[PDB]
Structures are given as C-alpha cells and as structure tokens.
Design a protein around this ligand. Structure first.
Ligand SMILES: *[C@@H]1O[C@H](CO)[C@@H](O[C@@H]2O[C@H](CO)[C@@H](O[C@@H]3O[C@H](CO[C@H]4O[C@H](CO[C@H]5O[C@H](CO)[C@@H](O)[C@H](O)[C@@H]5O)[C@@H](O)[C@H](O[C@H]5O[C@H](CO)[C@@H](O)[C@H](O)[C@@H]5O[C@H]5O[C@H](CO)[C@@H](O)[C@H](O)[C@@H]5O)[C@@H]4O)[C@@H](O)[C@H](O[C@H]4O[C@H](CO)[C@@H](O)[C@H](O)[C@@H]4O[C@H]4O[C@H](CO)[C@@H](O)[C@H](O)[C@@H]4O)[C@@H]3O)[C@H](O)[C@H]2NC(C)=O)[C@H](O)[C@H]1NC(C)=O
Ligand code: XSK
Ligand code: CA
Ligand code: CL
Ligand code: K
Ligand code: NA
Ligand code: ZN
Length: 804
C-alpha cells in the first residue's frame, strides 16, 4: 500500500528509491503501482514532441513542453537533443567525420569518463551488415570504435538470463536466472514474466554492475525502464542526469530498447517489417550522441552498444508435441518453446520415473527436432546444470522449432514468426558488441567473444574491482586503449616428482600380460635418453600444465609423449604429444592386442591393475597416448604401459578410437601438425569444477580406480599454418572438446552406423574452451610460450563452434 497523495514536483526520476508509503517517482514506480498522483503530468511530459523546430528557437521557457528550445536549456540540461543543430547551426554527430579520441575530453569536475550501456533486445549479429544502410549512427559507432563481428550470448538464449549475465559476468546456473520462467522447489515459489514474484530479491544472485559500482562509491543511473516510458524520454532522462552537480551525477548509465526483438517475434528476423524498428533504434542512438555532443560529452563518455541474443525463424507449424511420444503426458510439467524442461506434475506420485521419460523421447522419429538429456549430460560448454531451478530433464530443441506438451497448448493458449532460446552456438542467436569512447580502441575489429566477459571490462572502464565471476579477467584487454588489467599467471601449487626406475617387474601383481619379452648401447643409450626427457621439447610445446591444487603426481617421459601421472587418481591428469603432418598411422600388432605393461617408475600400490577390468563386466580401458601413432615399433611398447591406461566403457571406446586412429591424423594433415593434450575429467556434482576424491561416485569394480565423467583433448597448432606446430613463431590456433564418458551412445541417433557417420558430429556438439577444461581439472595450460599473457587468456576463452 502506497499513500499516492505526495507529489513528484522536482523529484522526477529521482535516484534514491524512497521506501513505502511515501509515493515514488522513480523509473520503476509504474511497475510497482506506486507513482505519485502527478507522476504522469510532471514526469512524462509529451507536449510539442521531441524535436526543436526553427520557430521554437530562443522561445520563452514553458515548463509543459517535453523538451526545450529556449536559451536557458543547456544550463537546465533539458534541451531537445537536436537543439544545437536546429537553433545554433551545429551538425548532427553522425555527420561529423570521425576523429580518434586519444584522451578523454571531459568538462571540469568529471572524475572519470562516464559509461553508457545502450542495450538492444533481439539484435541479431547479422543486422550490423544487413541493416547497415538504414543505421548510419550505429554504423558510425561500429566503424570508428571497437567492434566484434558478433558476441556469443549464454544458454538459454532468452532475455532475462542474458541481460542479467551481461550485468553480473555469471552463467545463469550461478546467477539463478535460468529461464524466463522458473520454479524454485526450496522456496516453493514460481518466477514469471507477468507479476510481482519476479521483483523479489531472492531470485537475483551474484552482484550486478550497479551494486558493484554503488558499494565502491561510483554512482549508478537506474538500469530498469517501465515499458510505457517512450525511448525519447529515457534518453532525455539520461542526459538530464548527466547535468547533475558532480557530487550527485552518476558515472554509469543503462538504456534498454525492446526493439528489434518485439517486431522480430511477430515478423521473423528478416521480415520486411523489420527495417522500421532498425531505423527507429538508429534514430535513438543519434538523439543520444547529439545530446552528448551538446553537453560536450561526445569525446568523454564510453558507449557500449550491446545486444542480449539474436532471433531465428520459428512458426506454429514447427512444433513437436510430447503427446506424440509419452503415454503418461499428464503426469509431467513442461517448460516449453525453444528449450524444454520436464519435471513431475506432483511430488506425491511415486510412479514417476525420469528414465522411462528419457527413453520414450530418445531417437523415436527419423526427423525428431529435439534431443532429451539429463542435465548433467548436456555439453559442458552450456554450463547449464548446477542450480536447483534447472529441471533434471532437458530438451535441446533444433533451431527453427518449438517443443510443447500437447497440440491444445499451441492453438488454445500462426501467432508469431521469430523466437530465440536455442543453443548459444547457433548463428541466428549471435548478437552484437561495439564500444566507442576514449577508453576503447580506434577503428579496431576484435574476434567474437562471450558476453560473460563484459562485466570485467565494464568494471575496468569505471575503475571498479569486479565481484568474482565467470569472465577471465584480461581476456578482453585487446579491446582497450588503456585501463588494461594486468593479470599474473596463477602459482603452481603442487610440484611434480621425477621418478627413475625403482621397481622390478616381479613386484607387480596386476593380472596384466604383454607379449613383450622380445629383445648394444646404440639403441640402449637412446632409450635412457627418452625416459629422461630428451624429446620433451617436441611433445611439450607450451611448458608443463601447472597443478593448482594440492596433490601427489609424477612427470613421466617417453619417446612419443609426456604425462603428469596422478598417484591419487591412478592415471594421468594430462598426456601431451605432438603429431607432425608427416606422421604415419599404424595398427596395433596382432600379438599386442591385450598387452598392458607395468611401469617400473611407479609403485604397484600407485598403479591400476588388469584384474579389475576383467572382473568389471561394464568397464573396459583405453589409452591416453594412442598406440596407433607410435613413432616406431619399439616406441609402441611405451603406449601399453599401465600408467597410460584409463577406464572406458566399450560404447565410449568406439568414439575414442575413431578420434585417435582417424581424427588426430586428419587434424595434423589440415593444420600442419597438432600438439594434443588429453586427459580425464571428474565432475560428478556437475558444478563445472574439478571433483575432489571424496566426490567420485563410481569406481572400476573392486578397485580404487575412479571412473571419469568426461575425457578432454586440447589440440593446438600454429595460427599461420605455413609453419609446423612444433616450430611456430607467432600466435596459436586451438580447438578443444570435453566428451561425455557414457556407457551407451543413445545421444547419437546414427551410432549403429560406422564411426565416420556420427562420431565427429558428437565431438562438434561437445566443443569446449581451454578455460572450461581448466575449471574441470585444476590445471593451467600455456605457461611457457612466446606470447603475451593477455593473448594467451584470449586463446583460452576461444571456442571452435563449427558454424559456417
Ligand atoms: C562462475 O563464477 C562463480 C562465482 O565466482 C562461481 O561460483 C562460486 O563458486 C564457489 C564454489 O562452488 C562458491 O563458494 C561457496 O559459497 C558458500 C557461501 O555462498 C554464499 O555466499 C556468496 C557470497 O555473497 C557475498 O559476496 C560478497 C563477497 O564475494 C559479499 O561482500 C556480499 O555480502 C555477498 O552477499 C553468494 O554468492 C552465494 O550465492 C549462491 O547461493 C544463493 C542462494 O543461497 C543464490 O542467490 C546465488 O545465485 C548463488 O547460487 C549459486 O551458487 C551456489 C553455491 O554457493 C549453488 O549451490 C547454486 O546452485 C548456484 O549455482 C551464497 O549466498 C560457502 O559457504 C561454500 O563453502 C562450503 O564448502 C567448502 C569446501 O571447501 C567448506 O570450506 C565450507 O565449510 C562449506 O562446506 C559446508 O557446506 C556444504 C553445503 O554447501 C556442506 O555440504 C558441508 O558439509 C559444509 O557444512 C563455498 O565457498 C560460491 O558461492 C559461488 N558463487 C556464486 C555467485 O555462484 C562458479 O564456480 C563459476 N563457475 C565455473 C564453472 O567456473
Ligand atoms: O528495463 C529493462 C532493461 O534491463 C536491463 C537489465 C540489465 C542490463 O544489463 C546491462 F546493462 F549490462 F546491459 C541492461 C538492461 N528491462 C529488461 C526487460 C526484459 N523484459 C521482458 O518483458 C521480456 C521477457 C521475455 C522476452 N523475450 N524476448 N524479449 C523479452 C522481454 C522487461 C524488462 C525491462
Ligand atoms: Ca565437480
Ligand atoms: Cl525459460
Ligand atoms: K571389463
Ligand atoms: Na545411438
Ligand atoms: Zn524476445
């Protein structure tokens, strides 16, 4: 209850939110039904419109006007944005040549260049090129400032999760806004687009930029705008706030546009009706820049033009219905549309079973346009699992489709032609980034990057310490002229041991055999050299990975590969090897098919054993360095050491073998050699972060051999592929993946076919950043290169997306 009997006189868009039951006048009061009686009259003036005309010039101030063309308007801070153009012979900002802004040019009393965030809903990346004719203001920011060809949103590519990811630098799983619609089972409360629950603070995790600023003494404009406040009023309010006295003036501001998203839903991303909303956005950008120029701020303020997600063609007739798959359709609740989330309709129903739901949804129709997952088996690059608000069952919907529960949900709930929400690597969901200002670079294109990285840079722009977040601070330093953040590499926490030969063969009782009793200082001094590290600079091109937690592990050298072998997990944390363009693939000799060899550098007590794999009817084993790529028959024996073995389900050995036998060589052929680092990942609580040993839920039967949830590989080569991977003088090129280690290939509907028709497609879906592997393994890669640390941070955030 508000006593809406007070007045907004001189309080319009006040920056303190006064507490009930004084009446409110802030840009949010409408949404709370709490505005003073006279809010509309005083604060939402519209008389005479938004532009000065020739006859208004020098007018007598009339306070009823939406904006002013009188002589006192510059000092009152409330001229129409085109005042100087119309009345003082000035040019529009878009008509001025662009001129490098080397230093901030700010009025006296400004302590730092203000930051203005101009955010646009549904602004698809390809609008920058495709709409460029009708957006001259936006085109000027883009070509004169710093721009990326596109910016990757987070999953799901829905509005609330992405705008709040922009504000916090966090994945939705960590900030808690995991959809536009949510149920939280602990609160027992629902979050909806319509209604008052969504305003409650307990949904909103993390620390958004306006709170980070405020706590550090930087004042912030209010980020939220009621839908019915016209764009022109939002702009004039920002400019008014920029004329406040020094002690009252914010340093950071946001503008938000519901367009082009709003028309994109009705007309599709490229409908002919979309040209108007692009013109209109651009005209708003021009009003802002004209208004800044008037206040002498156009070479002082940093502007970010940034979208939340793109927009795809999606129509009612491209809907899949769960009623065509499930017999028990009324026992589930579905969150529907461009993603699916399924939970039980009632917790009192003990006949509910996720396994039979998943199975009824798996590979059931030839053209099926969604795929079911338990949330922990989603591609780790989505980081969409670690939150009680994300339902255990997830459907990843193909681009251009919806999923709904029953046909009656579509016709009695076409009505629309565009939507978004799909997988964040989809081209149509990509969005935009431009920075323009003294602190951004001049006419500089930067590579695509993810929206989780912007929060750190916004903090950098405002001299703030960011709250802990999912960006990699320093990865976007190349966007900035100054204010760069200079990180240092993390300190290694555990140092390796370098074991020599310490055990005789008969000390091992592992149930392993190898047909190897077949056998000079020519070929004998040479083998000693190889076990001491003599070929280590061929196979370890960027230094050893550092271990950033407390553990016990051994470096092991071999002719063809080097490994860091964990005595705690009984297998390598990492295995590093280089395959040149010239390398040849050989088969495993007949006699050596089941060969496993004790490693005389490593105690029986810290080794796996073959018996456990024999006794374990479900689990087999594979090798991290592939026997197929051995440099010689003799070197091949090294690949069968017990210390190169890792537990693998037969189903997963199909994927791994094809990767190792076919794909590594293919990559070495195309990239002019590749360095590969491979290893296991344990993430049983699906939090994106390395498990400690007491979190492991599965072992090889009768043993202490822990079973990985995933296997990773990082594949590096020279960005200039005229140089071979092992003699590369400049920037690197990387692709990586984190394959889920699963006992079936149910994910891959074509898997009964030959691996050439399905494995590479699985791997592409599970593409990852080196940074994703860092979090999952507690390792730090690329510690010894000739590149600057900032450039290495950017390489570690790279994602190879396989889109066109
Ligand atoms: C992406 O980046 C993010 C952010 O960096 C990473 O997420 C962080 O990762 C940490 C490890 O998972 C985690 O540390 C936890 O935190 C526990 C305390 O957490 C609360 O406090 C947080 C701080 O708020 C304040 O921030 C500043 C200082 O930074 C202050 O000035 C202000 O005053 C702020 O208020 C807060 O952020 C956090 O919020 C979460 O939970 C809220 C609901 O309660 C949500 O609103 C919000 O959205 C957050 O939700 C996410 O995170 C939680 C995990 O916290 C998760 O469950 C949700 O699903 C969701 O994903 C809290 O309010 C701390 O107590 C923990 O310590 C335990 O474990 C250690 C083991 O070493 C023990 O020492 C300790 O005793 C304790 O164990 C005990 O408790 C156990 C139960 O957990 C029990 O089993 C056990 O037996 C013991 O009794 C631990 O440090 C961060 O909280 C988390 N931060 C955020 C924002 O998510 C993320 O990892 C990155 N992702 C990737 C892939 O890299
Ligand atoms: O006023 C703002 C600006 O809010 C920020 C926050 C952070 C922010 O972060 C920053 F600054 F870093 F960009 C920027 C603007 N609003 C965000 C709007 C989204 N709304 C929807 O109703 C909605 C729901 C589903 C949709 N699908 N498609 N479009 C959709 C739109 C109303 C909200 C009002
Ligand atoms: Ca984990
Ligand atoms: Cl949602
Ligand atoms: K077995
Ligand atoms: Na299959
Ligand atoms: Zn939308």
């Amino acid at each position: 209850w508000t006593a809406t009997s007070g007045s907004c006189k001189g309080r319009c868009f006040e920056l303190q939110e006064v507490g009930p039951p004084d009446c409110r006048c802030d840009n949010l009061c409408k949404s709370y039904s709490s505005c003073c009686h006279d809010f509309d009259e005083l604060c939402l003036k519209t008389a005479r419109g938004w532009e000065c005309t020739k006859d208004r010039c020098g007018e007598v101030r009339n306070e009823e006007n939406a904006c002013h063309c009188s002589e006192d308007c510059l000092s009152r801070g409330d001229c129409c944005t085109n005042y100087q153009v119309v009345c003082k012979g000035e040019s529009h900002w878009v008509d001025d040549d662009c001129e490098e802004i080397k230093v901030p040019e700010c009025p006296a009393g400004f302590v730092r260049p203000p930051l203005i965030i101009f955010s646009v809903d549904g602004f698809r990346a390809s609008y920058m090129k495709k709409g460029s004719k009708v957006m001259p203001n936006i085109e000027k920011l883009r070509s004169c400032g710093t721009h990326a060809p596109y910016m990757r949103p987070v999953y799901p590519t829905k509005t609330f999760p992405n705008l709040y990811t922009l504000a916090t630098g966090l994945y939705p799983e960590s900030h808690g806004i995991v959809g536009n619609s949510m149920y939280d089972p602990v609160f027992d409360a629902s979050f909806h687009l319509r209604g008052r629950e969504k305003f409650n603070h307990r949904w909103w995790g993390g620390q958004p930029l306006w709170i980070t600023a405020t706590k550090q003494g930087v004042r912030a404009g209010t980020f939220f705008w009621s839908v019915s406040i016209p764009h022109e009023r939002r702009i004039l309010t920002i400019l008014q706030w920029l004329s406040l006295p020094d002690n009252e003036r914010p340093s950071v501001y946001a503008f938000y546009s519901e367009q082009p998203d709003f028309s994109g839903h009705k007309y599709g991303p490229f409908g002919p009706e979309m040209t108007n909303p692009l013109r209109e956005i651009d005209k708003t950008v021009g009003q802002l820049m004209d208004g800044l120029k008037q206040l002498r701020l156009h070479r002082c303020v940093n502007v970010i033009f940034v979208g939340d997600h793109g927009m795809e063609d999606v129509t009612c007739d491209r809907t899949e219905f769960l009623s065509n798959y499930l017999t028990n359709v009324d026992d589930i609740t579905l969150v529907p549309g461009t993603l699916g989330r399924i939970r039980a309709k009632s917790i009192n129903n003990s006949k509910y079973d996720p396994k039979t739901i998943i199975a009824a949804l798996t590979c059931k129709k030839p053209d099926q346009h969604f795929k079911p997952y338990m949330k922990q088996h989603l591609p780790k690059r989505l980081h969409y699992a670690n939150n009680r608000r994300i339902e255990d069952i997830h459907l990843l919907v193909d681009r251009r489709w919806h999923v709904a529960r029953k046909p009656l949900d579509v016709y009695k709930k076409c009505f629309f032609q565009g939507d978004h929400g799909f997988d964040n690597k989809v081209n149509s969901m990509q969005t935009v980034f431009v920075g323009y200002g003294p602190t951004f670079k001049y006419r500089t294109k930067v590579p695509p990057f993810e929206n989780i990285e912007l929060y750190n840079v916004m903090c950098d722009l405002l001299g703030l310490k960011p709250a802990p977040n999912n960006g990699t601070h320093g990865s976007l330093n190349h966007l900035l002229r100054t204010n760069t953040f200079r990180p240092t590499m993390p300190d290694e926490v555990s140092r390796p041991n370098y074991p020599g030969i310490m055990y005789l063969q008969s000390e091992f009782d592992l149930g392993c055999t190898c047909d190897d009793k077949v056998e000079n200082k020519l070929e004998e001094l040479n083998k000693r050299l190889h076990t001491k590290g003599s070929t280590k600079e061929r196979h370890l091109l960027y230094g050893r990975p550092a271990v950033l937690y407390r553990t016990s592990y051994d470096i092991l050298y071999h002719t063809d590969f080097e490994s860091g072998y964990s005595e705690i997990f009984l297998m390598p944390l990492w295995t590093s090897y280089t395959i040149s363009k010239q390398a040849e693939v050989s088969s495993i000799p007949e006699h050596l098919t089941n060969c496993v060899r004790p490693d005389v550098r490593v105690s029986p007590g810290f080794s796996q054993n073959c018996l456990a794999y024999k006794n374990d009817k479900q689990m087999s084993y594979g090798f991290l360095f592939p026997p197929y790529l051995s440099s010689s028959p003799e070197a091949k024996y090294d690949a069968f050491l017990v210390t190169n073995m890792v537990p693998m389900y037969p189903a997963f050995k199909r994927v791994w073998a094809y990767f190792q036998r076919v794909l590594v060589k293919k990559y070495a052929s195309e990239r002019n050699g590749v360095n590969v680092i491979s290893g296991p990942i344990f993430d049983y609580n699906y939090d994106g972060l390395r498990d400690t040993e007491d979190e492991i839920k599965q072992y090889v039967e009768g043993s202490s051999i822990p079973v990985p949830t995933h296997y990773y590989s990082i594949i590096t080569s020279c960005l200039d592929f005229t140089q071979p991977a092992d003699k590369c003088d400049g920037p690197l090129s990387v692709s990586s993946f984190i394959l889920p280690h699963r006992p079936d290939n149910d994910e891959s509907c074509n898997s009964s076919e030959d691996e050439s028709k399905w494995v590479e497609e699985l791997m592409k879906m599970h593409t990852a950043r080196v940074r994703d592997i860092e979090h999952l393994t507690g390792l730090d890669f690329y510690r010894k290169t000739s590149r600057s640390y900032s450039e290495i941070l950017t390489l570690k955030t790279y994602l190879h997306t396989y889109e066109s």
